[PDB]
Amino acid sequence: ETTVKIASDSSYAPFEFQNGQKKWVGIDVDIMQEVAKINDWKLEMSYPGFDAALQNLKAGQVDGIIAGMTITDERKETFDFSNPYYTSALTIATTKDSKLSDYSDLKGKAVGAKNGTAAQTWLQENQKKYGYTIKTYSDGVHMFAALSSGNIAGAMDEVPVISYAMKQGQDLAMNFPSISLPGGYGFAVMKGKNSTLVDGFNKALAEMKSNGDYDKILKKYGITA
Template sequence: MKKFKNVILFMTTLALALTAACSGSKSNESAASEQNSQETTSDSNKYIIATDTVFAPFEFTDASNKFVGIDVELLDAIATDQGFEYELNSLGFDAALLAVEAGQADGVIAGMSITEERKAKYDFSDSYYESNVTMAVAIDSDISSYEDLSGKKVAVKTGTKGADFAKSIMEQYGFEITEFSDSPNMYQDVIVGNTVACFEDYPVMAYNIKQGAKLQMPGDIKESGSSYGFAVSKDKNSELLEMFNKGLANIKANGTYDEIIEKYTK
Protein backbone atom coordinates (compact mmCIF):
# COMPACT_ATOMS: atom_id res chain seq x y z
CA MET A 1 0.00 0.00 0.00
CA LYS A 2 2.86 2.34 0.84
CA LYS A 3 4.51 1.55 -2.49
CA PHE A 4 1.23 2.21 -4.29
CA LYS A 5 0.94 5.65 -2.61
CA ASN A 6 4.51 6.46 -3.62
CA VAL A 7 3.73 5.58 -7.24
CA ILE A 8 0.68 7.87 -7.21
CA LEU A 9 2.72 10.68 -5.69
CA PHE A 10 5.42 10.21 -8.34
CA MET A 11 2.91 10.24 -11.21
CA THR A 12 1.19 13.38 -9.87
CA THR A 13 4.51 15.21 -9.51
CA LEU A 14 5.51 14.21 -13.06
CA ALA A 15 2.20 15.44 -14.50
CA LEU A 16 2.54 18.79 -12.77
CA ALA A 17 6.10 19.17 -14.05
CA LEU A 18 5.05 18.42 -17.63
CA THR A 19 2.16 20.91 -17.39
CA ALA A 20 4.48 23.66 -16.12
CA ALA A 21 6.98 22.90 -18.86
CA CYS A 22 4.32 23.13 -21.59
CA SER A 23 2.94 26.33 -20.08
CA GLY A 24 6.40 27.85 -19.93
CA SER A 25 7.06 26.89 -23.54
CA LYS A 26 3.86 28.60 -24.73
CA SER A 27 4.64 31.68 -22.65
CA ASN A 28 8.12 31.90 -24.17
CA GLU A 29 6.71 31.50 -27.68
CA SER A 30 4.17 34.26 -26.99
CA ALA A 31 6.88 36.58 -25.66
CA ALA A 32 9.08 35.86 -28.66
CA SER A 33 6.20 36.54 -31.03
CA GLU A 34 5.42 39.84 -29.30
CA GLN A 35 9.06 40.87 -29.44
CA ASN A 36 9.25 40.07 -33.16
CA SER A 37 6.08 42.13 -33.73
CA GLN A 38 7.56 45.09 -31.87
CA GLU A 39 10.80 44.83 -33.84
CA THR A 40 8.86 44.78 -37.12
CA THR A 41 6.94 47.90 -36.13
CA SER A 42 9.99 49.81 -34.98
CA ASP A 43 11.93 48.86 -38.11
CA SER A 44 9.14 50.08 -40.39
CA ASN A 45 10.21 52.70 -42.93
CA LYS A 46 6.68 54.05 -43.49
CA TYR A 47 5.88 57.59 -42.40
CA ILE A 48 2.58 59.35 -41.78
CA ILE A 49 2.52 62.69 -43.62
CA ALA A 50 -0.25 65.22 -42.97
CA THR A 51 -1.46 67.78 -45.50
CA ASP A 52 -4.21 70.27 -46.27
CA THR A 53 -7.49 69.32 -47.98
CA VAL A 54 -7.93 72.13 -50.50
CA PHE A 55 -5.03 74.41 -51.45
CA ALA A 56 -4.80 74.15 -55.22
CA PRO A 57 -2.46 73.84 -57.01
CA PHE A 58 -0.50 72.38 -54.09
CA GLU A 59 -3.08 69.86 -52.84
CA PHE A 60 -6.63 69.27 -54.04
CA THR A 61 -9.00 66.69 -55.49
CA ASP A 62 -9.26 66.66 -59.30
CA ALA A 63 -12.26 65.89 -61.53
CA SER A 64 -11.67 62.14 -61.23
CA ASN A 65 -11.71 62.42 -57.40
CA LYS A 66 -7.96 61.80 -57.19
CA PHE A 67 -5.91 63.75 -54.64
CA VAL A 68 -3.27 65.65 -56.63
CA GLY A 69 -1.13 68.79 -56.63
CA ILE A 70 2.41 70.11 -56.44
CA ASP A 71 2.96 68.97 -52.84
CA VAL A 72 1.44 65.55 -53.53
CA GLU A 73 3.65 64.87 -56.55
CA LEU A 74 6.81 66.33 -55.02
CA LEU A 75 6.43 64.14 -51.94
CA ASP A 76 5.88 61.05 -54.08
CA ALA A 77 8.91 61.79 -56.26
CA ILE A 78 11.11 62.39 -53.20
CA ALA A 79 9.91 59.21 -51.48
CA THR A 80 10.63 57.21 -54.62
CA ASP A 81 14.09 58.76 -54.93
CA GLN A 82 14.94 58.08 -51.27
CA GLY A 83 13.22 54.70 -50.96
CA PHE A 84 10.81 55.36 -48.11
CA GLU A 85 7.10 54.62 -47.84
CA TYR A 86 4.48 57.06 -46.61
CA GLU A 87 0.79 57.45 -45.95
CA LEU A 88 -0.62 60.86 -46.89
CA ASN A 89 -3.45 62.08 -44.65
CA SER A 90 -5.56 64.98 -45.93
CA LEU A 91 -6.67 66.73 -42.72
CA GLY A 92 -6.88 70.46 -43.33
CA PHE A 93 -4.09 72.92 -42.56
CA ASP A 94 -4.69 73.53 -38.85
CA ALA A 95 -5.44 69.85 -38.17
CA ALA A 96 -2.29 68.82 -40.05
CA LEU A 97 -0.14 70.98 -37.80
CA LEU A 98 -1.86 69.65 -34.68
CA ALA A 99 -1.32 66.07 -35.85
CA VAL A 100 2.44 66.67 -36.09
CA GLU A 101 2.56 68.39 -32.71
CA ALA A 102 0.64 65.51 -31.10
CA GLY A 103 2.87 62.85 -32.65
CA GLN A 104 0.03 61.49 -34.81
CA ALA A 105 1.93 62.39 -37.98
CA ASP A 106 5.65 62.36 -38.73
CA GLY A 107 5.66 65.37 -41.01
CA VAL A 108 3.55 67.92 -42.85
CA ILE A 109 3.59 69.26 -46.42
CA ALA A 110 0.82 71.78 -47.07
CA GLY A 111 2.12 74.92 -48.75
CA MET A 112 3.48 75.81 -45.33
CA SER A 113 5.42 79.07 -45.10
CA ILE A 114 8.72 78.92 -43.24
CA THR A 115 8.54 81.56 -40.49
CA GLU A 116 10.59 82.33 -37.40
CA GLU A 117 7.54 81.74 -35.21
CA ARG A 118 6.98 78.28 -36.65
CA LYS A 119 10.65 77.38 -36.31
CA ALA A 120 10.09 77.33 -32.55
CA LYS A 121 7.81 74.30 -33.00
CA TYR A 122 9.03 72.68 -36.19
CA ASP A 123 12.19 71.82 -38.07
CA PHE A 124 11.91 72.76 -41.75
CA SER A 125 13.37 71.33 -44.92
CA ASP A 126 15.09 73.40 -47.56
CA SER A 127 12.57 75.58 -49.36
CA TYR A 128 10.78 73.76 -52.17
CA TYR A 129 8.79 76.76 -53.47
CA GLU A 130 9.03 80.56 -53.37
CA SER A 131 5.66 82.32 -53.24
CA ASN A 132 4.32 85.90 -53.29
CA VAL A 133 1.09 87.25 -51.76
CA THR A 134 -1.67 88.84 -53.83
CA MET A 135 -5.08 90.45 -53.32
CA ALA A 136 -8.16 89.24 -55.18
CA VAL A 137 -11.65 90.75 -55.53
CA ALA A 138 -14.90 89.73 -57.23
CA ILE A 139 -14.83 90.11 -61.04
CA ASP A 140 -17.41 92.94 -60.94
CA SER A 141 -15.75 94.76 -58.02
CA ASP A 142 -14.59 98.38 -58.16
CA ILE A 143 -11.85 97.71 -55.55
CA SER A 144 -8.54 98.50 -57.22
CA SER A 145 -6.16 99.35 -54.35
CA TYR A 146 -5.60 98.95 -50.64
CA GLU A 147 -7.07 102.43 -50.07
CA ASP A 148 -10.42 101.15 -51.39
CA LEU A 149 -10.59 98.64 -48.51
CA SER A 150 -11.18 101.35 -45.90
CA GLY A 151 -14.20 100.63 -43.71
CA LYS A 152 -14.81 97.26 -45.34
CA LYS A 153 -14.30 93.57 -44.49
CA VAL A 154 -11.48 91.47 -45.95
CA ALA A 155 -11.24 87.67 -45.97
CA VAL A 156 -8.12 85.66 -45.08
CA LYS A 157 -7.27 82.01 -44.48
CA THR A 158 -6.10 81.33 -40.91
CA GLY A 159 -2.40 80.65 -40.48
CA THR A 160 -1.28 81.74 -43.95
CA LYS A 161 1.19 84.34 -45.15
CA GLY A 162 -1.73 86.12 -46.80
CA ALA A 163 -3.41 86.45 -43.42
CA ASP A 164 -0.19 87.75 -41.86
CA PHE A 165 0.19 90.36 -44.58
CA ALA A 166 -3.44 91.51 -44.32
CA LYS A 167 -3.10 91.89 -40.55
CA SER A 168 0.07 93.91 -41.01
CA ILE A 169 -1.71 96.57 -43.10
CA MET A 170 -5.27 96.48 -41.68
CA GLU A 171 -4.80 99.46 -39.35
CA GLN A 172 -3.02 101.49 -41.99
CA TYR A 173 -5.85 101.04 -44.50
CA GLY A 174 -8.72 100.79 -42.00
CA PHE A 175 -10.36 97.47 -42.85
CA GLU A 176 -11.62 94.53 -40.78
CA ILE A 177 -10.65 90.89 -41.18
CA THR A 178 -12.82 87.78 -41.38
CA GLU A 179 -10.93 84.50 -41.06
CA PHE A 180 -11.65 81.17 -42.78
CA SER A 181 -10.19 77.71 -42.31
CA ASP A 182 -10.01 76.93 -46.04
CA SER A 183 -9.58 78.77 -49.33
CA PRO A 184 -12.82 77.77 -51.15
CA ASN A 185 -15.05 79.23 -48.44
CA MET A 186 -12.89 82.34 -48.34
CA TYR A 187 -13.24 82.80 -52.12
CA GLN A 188 -17.00 82.25 -51.99
CA ASP A 189 -17.38 84.86 -49.28
CA VAL A 190 -15.75 87.43 -51.56
CA ILE A 191 -17.74 86.32 -54.62
CA VAL A 192 -21.11 86.72 -52.84
CA GLY A 193 -20.07 90.09 -51.40
CA ASN A 194 -19.86 89.42 -47.68
CA THR A 195 -16.23 90.54 -47.86
CA VAL A 196 -14.76 92.76 -50.57
CA ALA A 197 -11.33 91.14 -51.03
CA CYS A 198 -9.08 88.32 -49.89
CA PHE A 199 -5.33 87.85 -49.58
CA GLU A 200 -3.83 84.64 -50.87
CA ASP A 201 -0.54 83.18 -52.10
CA TYR A 202 -0.12 84.26 -55.72
CA PRO A 203 0.23 80.82 -57.38
CA VAL A 204 -2.83 79.55 -55.51
CA MET A 205 -4.97 82.51 -56.57
CA ALA A 206 -3.70 82.47 -60.16
CA TYR A 207 -4.50 78.75 -60.46
CA ASN A 208 -8.03 79.12 -59.07
CA ILE A 209 -8.82 82.04 -61.37
CA LYS A 210 -7.53 79.99 -64.28
CA GLN A 211 -9.87 77.18 -63.20
CA GLY A 212 -12.88 79.49 -63.28
CA ALA A 213 -13.12 81.19 -59.89
CA LYS A 214 -15.07 84.44 -60.36
CA LEU A 215 -12.25 86.56 -58.97
CA GLN A 216 -9.64 88.94 -60.32
CA MET A 217 -6.35 90.36 -59.11
CA PRO A 218 -6.54 94.16 -59.52
CA GLY A 219 -3.29 95.49 -60.91
CA ASP A 220 -1.76 92.03 -60.55
CA ILE A 221 -0.56 92.94 -57.04
CA LYS A 222 2.39 90.90 -55.76
CA GLU A 223 3.75 91.43 -52.29
CA SER A 224 6.81 89.79 -50.80
CA GLY A 225 5.75 86.32 -49.78
CA SER A 226 7.49 83.36 -48.26
CA SER A 227 9.30 80.09 -48.79
CA TYR A 228 7.36 76.83 -48.51
CA GLY A 229 8.92 73.98 -46.57
CA PHE A 230 8.26 70.43 -45.46
CA ALA A 231 8.21 70.26 -41.65
CA VAL A 232 8.61 67.81 -38.78
CA SER A 233 8.13 68.35 -35.06
CA LYS A 234 11.04 70.11 -33.35
CA ASP A 235 14.03 67.78 -32.80
CA LYS A 236 12.13 64.73 -34.12
CA ASN A 237 12.27 62.67 -37.34
CA SER A 238 15.59 64.17 -38.40
CA GLU A 239 16.16 61.17 -40.72
CA LEU A 240 12.93 61.96 -42.59
CA LEU A 241 13.91 65.61 -42.94
CA GLU A 242 17.33 64.62 -44.25
CA MET A 243 15.81 62.28 -46.83
CA PHE A 244 13.41 65.01 -47.96
CA ASN A 245 16.28 67.44 -48.52
CA LYS A 246 18.38 64.87 -50.39
CA GLY A 247 15.44 63.79 -52.51
CA LEU A 248 14.51 67.40 -53.28
CA ALA A 249 18.04 68.14 -54.45
CA ASN A 250 18.03 65.02 -56.63
CA ILE A 251 14.70 65.70 -58.35
CA LYS A 252 15.76 69.29 -58.99
CA ALA A 253 18.95 67.99 -60.61
CA ASN A 254 17.24 65.41 -62.83
CA GLY A 255 14.44 67.69 -64.05
CA THR A 256 11.53 66.02 -62.22
CA TYR A 257 10.97 69.07 -60.02
CA ASP A 258 10.56 71.45 -62.97
CA GLU A 259 8.18 69.04 -64.70
CA ILE A 260 5.90 68.95 -61.63
CA ILE A 261 5.93 72.73 -61.12
CA GLU A 262 5.22 73.48 -64.79
CA LYS A 263 2.39 70.93 -64.86
CA TYR A 264 0.42 73.00 -62.32
CA THR A 265 1.54 76.57 -62.93
CA LYS A 266 1.83 76.99 -66.72
Protein backbone atom coordinates in the same frame (compact mmCIF):
# COMPACT_ATOMS: atom_id res chain seq x y z
CA GLU B 1 12.28 49.87 -47.88
CA THR B 2 11.79 52.54 -45.13
CA THR B 3 8.11 53.19 -44.25
CA VAL B 4 7.43 56.93 -43.97
CA LYS B 5 4.13 58.20 -42.57
CA ILE B 6 3.22 61.72 -43.65
CA ALA B 7 0.12 63.70 -42.59
CA SER B 8 -1.43 66.58 -44.53
CA ASP B 9 -4.49 68.80 -44.75
CA SER B 10 -7.86 67.46 -45.96
CA SER B 11 -8.53 70.28 -48.44
CA TYR B 12 -6.07 73.05 -49.45
CA ALA B 13 -5.86 73.36 -53.23
CA PRO B 14 -3.44 73.55 -54.92
CA PHE B 15 -1.28 71.88 -52.23
CA GLU B 16 -3.53 68.90 -51.43
CA PHE B 17 -7.09 68.13 -52.52
CA GLN B 18 -9.30 65.41 -53.92
CA ASN B 19 -10.17 65.47 -57.60
CA GLY B 20 -13.46 64.28 -59.16
CA GLN B 21 -12.32 60.65 -58.91
CA LYS B 22 -11.51 61.26 -55.19
CA LYS B 23 -7.79 60.77 -55.95
CA TRP B 24 -5.45 62.85 -53.76
CA VAL B 25 -3.63 65.40 -55.94
CA GLY B 26 -1.74 68.68 -55.58
CA ILE B 27 1.76 70.16 -55.35
CA ASP B 28 2.43 68.62 -51.92
CA VAL B 29 1.07 65.20 -52.93
CA ASP B 30 3.11 65.03 -56.17
CA ILE B 31 6.31 66.38 -54.53
CA MET B 32 6.09 63.97 -51.59
CA GLN B 33 5.39 60.95 -53.84
CA GLU B 34 8.42 61.71 -56.06
CA VAL B 35 10.68 62.37 -53.01
CA ALA B 36 9.64 58.98 -51.61
CA LYS B 37 10.41 57.20 -54.89
CA ILE B 38 13.80 58.96 -55.25
CA ASN B 39 14.68 57.90 -51.67
CA ASP B 40 13.18 54.37 -51.87
CA TRP B 41 10.62 55.15 -49.15
CA LYS B 42 7.30 53.38 -48.75
CA LEU B 43 5.06 56.44 -48.36
CA GLU B 44 1.91 56.29 -46.22
CA MET B 45 0.01 59.57 -46.70
CA SER B 46 -2.88 60.59 -44.41
CA TYR B 47 -5.21 63.63 -44.79
CA PRO B 48 -6.77 64.41 -41.34
CA GLY B 49 -6.45 68.20 -41.60
CA PHE B 50 -3.65 70.66 -40.79
CA ASP B 51 -4.40 70.88 -37.04
CA ALA B 52 -4.79 67.10 -36.63
CA ALA B 53 -1.60 66.54 -38.67
CA LEU B 54 0.36 68.73 -36.22
CA GLN B 55 -1.19 66.86 -33.24
CA ASN B 56 -0.32 63.50 -34.83
CA LEU B 57 3.26 64.64 -35.60
CA LYS B 58 3.89 65.80 -32.03
CA ALA B 59 2.46 62.53 -30.66
CA GLY B 60 4.77 60.52 -32.98
CA GLN B 61 1.87 58.88 -34.86
CA VAL B 62 3.34 60.27 -38.09
CA ASP B 63 6.95 61.08 -39.05
CA GLY B 64 6.42 64.33 -40.94
CA ILE B 65 3.99 66.87 -42.41
CA ILE B 66 3.61 68.53 -45.81
CA ALA B 67 0.53 70.80 -45.88
CA GLY B 68 1.09 74.25 -47.43
CA MET B 69 2.99 74.97 -44.21
CA THR B 70 4.82 78.30 -44.13
CA ILE B 71 8.24 78.15 -42.46
CA THR B 72 8.47 80.70 -39.64
CA ASP B 73 11.04 81.26 -36.88
CA GLU B 74 8.41 80.53 -34.23
CA ARG B 75 7.59 77.16 -35.86
CA LYS B 76 11.32 76.28 -35.96
CA GLU B 77 11.28 76.22 -32.17
CA THR B 78 9.08 73.10 -32.40
CA PHE B 79 9.84 71.63 -35.86
CA ASP B 80 12.81 71.12 -38.15
CA PHE B 81 12.13 72.08 -41.75
CA SER B 82 13.39 71.19 -45.18
CA ASN B 83 14.74 73.80 -47.53
CA PRO B 84 11.63 75.59 -48.87
CA TYR B 85 9.96 73.83 -51.81
CA TYR B 86 8.06 76.97 -52.92
CA THR B 87 8.14 80.72 -52.13
CA SER B 88 5.43 81.94 -49.76
CA ALA B 89 3.82 85.21 -50.94
CA LEU B 90 0.48 87.03 -50.54
CA THR B 91 -1.36 89.15 -53.09
CA ILE B 92 -4.65 90.91 -53.73
CA ALA B 93 -6.58 89.27 -56.57
CA THR B 94 -9.07 91.24 -58.67
CA THR B 95 -11.47 90.29 -61.45
CA LYS B 96 -9.98 89.71 -64.90
CA ASP B 97 -10.96 93.17 -66.30
CA SER B 98 -10.13 95.23 -63.19
CA LYS B 99 -7.81 98.20 -63.65
CA LEU B 100 -6.91 98.40 -59.93
CA SER B 101 -3.13 98.06 -59.59
CA ASP B 102 -1.98 100.09 -56.54
CA TYR B 103 -3.04 99.97 -52.88
CA SER B 104 -4.27 103.58 -53.07
CA ASP B 105 -6.82 102.41 -55.70
CA LEU B 106 -8.68 100.51 -52.93
CA LYS B 107 -9.72 103.76 -51.22
CA GLY B 108 -13.44 103.57 -50.50
CA LYS B 109 -13.57 99.90 -51.63
CA ALA B 110 -14.16 96.60 -49.82
CA VAL B 111 -11.31 94.05 -49.69
CA GLY B 112 -11.69 90.43 -48.59
CA ALA B 113 -9.57 87.98 -46.65
CA LYS B 114 -10.11 84.65 -44.93
CA ASN B 115 -10.59 84.72 -41.17
CA GLY B 116 -7.44 84.12 -39.07
CA THR B 117 -4.87 84.50 -41.88
CA ALA B 118 -1.71 86.50 -42.54
CA ALA B 119 -3.75 88.18 -45.31
CA GLN B 120 -6.35 89.33 -42.74
CA THR B 121 -3.51 90.74 -40.55
CA TRP B 122 -1.91 92.63 -43.47
CA LEU B 123 -5.27 94.15 -44.42
CA GLN B 124 -5.93 95.18 -40.77
CA GLU B 125 -2.43 96.68 -40.47
CA ASN B 126 -2.87 98.76 -43.69
CA GLN B 127 -6.59 99.76 -43.55
CA LYS B 128 -6.10 103.31 -42.15
CA LYS B 129 -3.26 103.93 -44.62
CA TYR B 130 -5.25 103.19 -47.81
CA GLY B 131 -8.92 103.67 -46.81
CA TYR B 132 -10.64 100.34 -47.71
CA THR B 133 -13.11 98.37 -45.62
CA ILE B 134 -12.39 94.74 -44.81
CA LYS B 135 -14.72 91.78 -45.34
CA THR B 136 -13.80 88.44 -43.71
CA TYR B 137 -14.72 85.03 -45.16
CA SER B 138 -14.87 81.45 -43.89
CA ASP B 139 -13.26 79.92 -47.00
CA GLY B 140 -12.10 80.63 -50.56
CA VAL B 141 -15.35 79.59 -52.24
CA HIS B 142 -17.21 82.40 -50.40
CA MET B 143 -14.42 85.00 -50.75
CA PHE B 144 -13.96 84.46 -54.53
CA ALA B 145 -17.74 84.44 -55.17
CA ALA B 146 -17.94 87.87 -53.48
CA LEU B 147 -15.05 89.08 -55.70
CA SER B 148 -16.69 87.81 -58.91
CA SER B 149 -20.00 89.51 -57.90
CA GLY B 150 -18.26 92.87 -57.42
CA ASN B 151 -19.26 93.05 -53.74
CA ILE B 152 -15.51 93.29 -52.99
CA ALA B 153 -12.90 94.99 -55.22
CA GLY B 154 -10.04 92.67 -54.16
CA ALA B 155 -9.41 89.42 -52.25
CA MET B 156 -6.11 88.86 -50.48
CA ASP B 157 -4.77 85.30 -50.33
CA GLU B 158 -1.67 83.15 -50.81
CA VAL B 159 -0.32 83.53 -54.35
CA PRO B 160 -0.50 79.77 -55.23
CA VAL B 161 -4.18 79.66 -54.18
CA ILE B 162 -5.06 82.55 -56.52
CA SER B 163 -2.85 81.07 -59.31
CA TYR B 164 -4.64 77.71 -59.14
CA ALA B 165 -8.11 79.30 -59.17
CA MET B 166 -7.07 81.38 -62.21
CA LYS B 167 -5.84 78.23 -64.04
CA GLN B 168 -9.18 76.55 -63.34
CA GLY B 169 -10.83 79.37 -65.28
CA GLN B 170 -12.01 81.58 -62.38
CA ASP B 171 -12.53 85.26 -63.18
CA LEU B 172 -9.28 86.57 -61.67
CA ALA B 173 -6.14 88.60 -62.35
CA MET B 174 -2.98 89.35 -60.34
CA ASN B 175 -2.77 93.14 -60.63
CA PHE B 176 -1.09 93.86 -57.26
CA PRO B 177 2.41 93.35 -55.79
CA SER B 178 3.40 89.99 -54.26
CA ILE B 179 4.22 90.37 -50.54
CA SER B 180 6.96 87.91 -49.66
CA LEU B 181 7.18 85.90 -46.42
CA PRO B 182 10.89 84.80 -46.27
CA GLY B 183 10.41 81.26 -44.93
CA GLY B 184 8.74 79.61 -47.93
CA TYR B 185 6.69 76.40 -47.68
CA GLY B 186 8.42 73.46 -45.95
CA PHE B 187 8.35 69.77 -45.15
CA ALA B 188 8.36 69.44 -41.31
CA VAL B 189 9.50 66.87 -38.78
CA MET B 190 9.78 67.16 -34.99
CA LYS B 191 12.77 69.26 -33.89
CA GLY B 192 15.93 67.18 -33.51
CA LYS B 193 14.31 64.08 -35.08
CA ASN B 194 14.31 62.34 -38.43
CA SER B 195 17.08 64.49 -39.93
CA THR B 196 17.60 61.77 -42.61
CA LEU B 197 14.00 62.36 -43.82
CA VAL B 198 14.65 66.13 -44.07
CA ASP B 199 17.95 65.46 -45.89
CA GLY B 200 16.29 63.04 -48.36
CA PHE B 201 13.62 65.69 -48.99
CA ASN B 202 16.30 68.30 -49.66
CA LYS B 203 18.37 66.04 -51.97
CA ALA B 204 15.28 64.89 -53.95
CA LEU B 205 14.02 68.50 -54.32
CA ALA B 206 17.40 69.57 -55.72
CA GLU B 207 17.36 66.66 -58.23
CA MET B 208 13.76 67.53 -59.22
CA LYS B 209 14.65 71.21 -59.85
CA SER B 210 17.65 70.04 -61.86
CA ASN B 211 15.81 67.52 -64.03
CA GLY B 212 12.68 69.64 -64.65
CA ASP B 213 10.24 67.44 -62.63
CA TYR B 214 9.79 70.29 -60.12
CA ASP B 215 8.71 72.73 -62.85
CA LYS B 216 6.34 70.09 -64.37
CA ILE B 217 4.56 69.80 -61.02
CA LEU B 218 4.12 73.54 -60.56
CA LYS B 219 2.68 73.93 -64.08
CA LYS B 220 0.27 70.97 -63.52
CA TYR B 221 -1.42 73.12 -60.85
CA GLY B 222 -1.12 76.49 -62.67
CA ILE B 223 1.48 78.03 -60.29
CA THR B 224 3.08 80.90 -62.30
CA ALA B 225 3.93 83.60 -59.73
